């Protein structure tokens, strides 16, 4: 049913890339992509991003900040958002899209991933290790 998912932040340097790039690690079959409702376009990584991924094993490389459209999400059978705010910035960008759309942190006791940019390593930490255990069971569910 879903093959196609789209993970988005706000920036899509922090959040989306490394929620991206954990699905794929799981569910190697599937398109999984990333893009920000605020995206710094054509930027890499933020450095803080790649630390902690790296730090955990994780390759955030060739990674490209990419702006969320509703066309772009039309390419995929299911967006997965970071924040609950996110949510209605998607039924204000893609009235269509809303109904596939669930947050990353869906199956978390607390579900919403807060925003780390700019934030000490100990916050990208905290929001590396919610990512995985949210990323985990996402998996969990669609195998
Ligand atoms: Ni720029």
């Known amino acids: 049913m879903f093959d196609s998912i789209l993970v988005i932040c706000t920036g899509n340097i922090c959040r989306s890339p490394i929620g991206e790039r954990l699905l794929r690690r799981l569910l190697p079959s599937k398109k999984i992509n990333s893009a920000g409702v605020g995206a710094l376009v054509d930027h890499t990584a933020d450095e803080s991003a790649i630390r902690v991924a790296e730090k955990n094993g994780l390759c955030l490389k060739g990674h490209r900040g990419t702006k969320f459209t509703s066309a772009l999400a039309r390419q995929y059978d299911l967006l997965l958002v970071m924040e609950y705010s996110h949510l209605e910035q998607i039924s204000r960008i893609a009235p269509e899209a809303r109904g596939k759309t669930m947050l990353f942190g869906h199956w ?36």
């Open 108 to 143: 978390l006791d607390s579900k919403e991933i807060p925003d780390p940019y700019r934030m000490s390593d100990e916050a990208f930490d905290s929001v590396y290790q919610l990512l995985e255990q949210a990323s985990k069971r996402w998996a969990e569910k669609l195998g």
